[PDB]
Paper text:
Congenital myasthenic syndrome-22 (CMS22, OMIM 616224) is a rare genetic disorder caused by deleterious genetic variation in the prolyl endopeptidase-like (PREPL) gene. The PREPL protein consists of 2 structural domains: an amino-terminal 7-bladed β-propeller domain and a carboxy-terminal α/β-hydrolase fold catalytic domain connected by a hinge loop. The active site is comprised of the triad residues Ser559, Asp645, and His690. However, in contrast to its homologues PREP and OpdB, PREPL does not appear to possess protease activity despite the structural similarities.
To investigate the potential impact of the patient variants on PREPL conformation we solved the structure of p.Arg243Cys mutant using cryoelectron microscopy. This PREPL mutant was chosen due to its ability to be purified to higher concentrations compared with the other PREPL variants and its stable behavior on the cryo-EM grids. The resulting map was resolved at a resolution of 4.01 Å (using the FSC 0.143 criterion). Therefore, this structural study shows that the Arg243Cys variant did not affect the ternary structure of PREPL. Arg243 is positioned on PREPL in the loop connecting the β-11 and β-12 sheets of the third blade of the propeller and is not conserved across the homologous PREP, OpdB, and AAP. This residue resides in an exposed region on the protein surface, where neither the original arginine nor the cysteine undergoes any interactions with neighboring residues. Based on its location in the PREPL structure, it is not surprising that the variant retains catalytic activity but, instead, may affect protein-protein interactions mediated by the β-propeller. Moreover, we evaluated the cleavage of DIFMUO by CMS22 PREPL variants, where we saw that PREPL p.Arg243Cys (102.6 ± 26.2) had fully conserved catalytic activity, while PREPL p.Arg647Gln (43.8 ± 8.3) showed a 2-fold decrease in substrate cleavage activity compared with the WT (100.0 ± 23.6). We next assessed the folding and thermal stability of PREPL mutants by circular dichroism (CD) spectroscopy. p.Arg243Cys, p.Arg647Gln, and p.Ser559Ala PREPL share the same secondary structure as the WT protein. They all exhibited similar thermal stability, with the melting temperature (Tm) of PREPL WT and the p.Ser559Ala and p.Arg647Gln mutants calculated to be 63.5°C, while the melting temperature of p.Arg243Cys was 61.5°C. Their unfolding process displayed a 2-step pattern indicative of the presence of 2 domains as expected: the helical catalytic domain and the β-propeller comprised of β sheets. PREPL p.Arg243Cys had 7 decreased (NDUFV2, MRPL11, MRPS12, ARPC5L, DCTN5, DISC1, MDM1) and 1 increased interaction (UBL5); PREPL p.Ile412Arg had 8 decreased interactions (NDUFV2, MRPL11, MRPS12, STX5, ARPC5L, DCTN5, DISC1, MDM1); and PREPL p.Arg647Gln had 5 decreased (NDUFV2, MRPL11, STX5, ARPC5L, DCTN5) and 3 increased interactions (UBL5, ADM2, DISC1).
Residue numbers in the entry: 111 to 133, 140 to 686, 694 to 720
The structure:
Amino acid sequence: INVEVKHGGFVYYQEGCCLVRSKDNYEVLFNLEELKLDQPFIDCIRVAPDEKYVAAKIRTEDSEASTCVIIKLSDQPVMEASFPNVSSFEWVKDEEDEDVLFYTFQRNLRCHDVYRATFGDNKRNECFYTEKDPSYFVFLYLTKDSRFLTINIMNKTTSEVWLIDGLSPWDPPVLIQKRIHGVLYYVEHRDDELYILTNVGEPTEFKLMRTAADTPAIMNWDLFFTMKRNTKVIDLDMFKDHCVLFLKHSNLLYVNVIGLADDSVRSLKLPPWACGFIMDTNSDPKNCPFQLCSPIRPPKYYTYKFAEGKLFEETGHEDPITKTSRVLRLEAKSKDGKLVPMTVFHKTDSEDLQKKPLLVHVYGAYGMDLKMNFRPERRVLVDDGWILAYCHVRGGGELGLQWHADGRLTKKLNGLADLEACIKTLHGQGFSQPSLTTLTAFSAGGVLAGALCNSNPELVRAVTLEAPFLDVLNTMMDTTLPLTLEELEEWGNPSSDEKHKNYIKRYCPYQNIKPQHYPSIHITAYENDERVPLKGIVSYTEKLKEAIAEHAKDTGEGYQTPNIILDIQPDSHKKITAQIKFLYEELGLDSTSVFED
């Protein structure tokens, strides 16, 4: 998370709790200690275009709030100004060469606001934008050629964009298009012509719409390029001559190189193991660098040189796991006949007897997808002979908006059905038998893991949960604390409508704990959180033990009892180590899991 900003040809990074300017020799612009903060970590650095000032925002743990500190970038590394609670900021070079800082903070929870800080003649904080609606978030973005500073007013379903001239920082912002509910727009400039990324008209289809910078209304927009329906745009990298569009769909990645000054589109060939895209913020201006990664392979560097056909792998580092592990894309068939993508990872020199411990990962909530970034512990499990699988199930977002809508408020059980289908499908393919199956889930995904434990316990041997959202019904029916509308729409309100109360009762894993055989379950939980009360987990743990205890008393006759383990913490490696030891003990695998990280 270490912030790195390169400008003026010298990079600026935070080291030793002090703002540092690097050409092993560095110059300290500021000492973060003076701010009287504990463990202050720099989240954002923005360097004035003419290097007179540098601004950065500094945050500490256990604080929602952070402060933006402005240092003179002059030979004097002294403080110029500071401003608390700044969400974002950016610099614009005035026509008088005055580097003015635009920044966004919030006047209480009432509204957010954009101010322009002038230092050279002491004009300080002039207001350029004021907010009216607390549900929207104001964020600043300047494009690459600094033609237009953009004020982005955003929500998840809709956005509004206002432009501030990069050649006239004092002018009032100009609205491109008044907000339309359900429509989000992102704006980039090429040559007194704008390209707009938008889902106007059709919510499930993002498209490239072009228009003159002086003719911003929707009615004047033409069509430049369209993406496949329900694909996810992760990024759009604008250049003078072309743009590079980065897309994801399902479990496939695509890169589209689209000429703008030359209307011809080019698709790039990506390797089959890539499961996600890492974007660079080096903003190099005559190349489009990016990295590809997978949960079992550290990020690799690729660069597209708009100039030549292809010179992508400039990186000299490569990992043999590319050839020693295989990435299968195998969909499962649901109870209602739908296809549920699943990503499966296994060794290519694996034995004919494909009956090895299988780890299944599920989230299935809030429209989120499963993060595919590299995790050394997951790779080790594969090196030891583990088969990993990721289930892209209803309630998440990999296949479109309807995937979030389904497997949700009145239909959560569909996410459960998709998880069940995935597990049975893997067993059906023959990767593992139930005795070697392991399931893992986090926070919201714990609902699905819990519910599966109650409905089909014979499918899993051991389950590993982190701070799971288990007692859904009491958490949701807690009228004392108002339920956030966001959640209220991710879990029906049982306090206002009996059908939600009944639907939730039907899937809530706490409520449905019943005397029967269970998988061994290890729970990692924390002392202090807001989303997952510890008392919920403790009650679950106590009730779960009682159910299996009653089961064991009537039918056990010497049979072993599933190990129910609750580990409370106020370190990631310690957590991982404990989880691996738990699973290996349950799976009777022993331990040679030695690694460098």
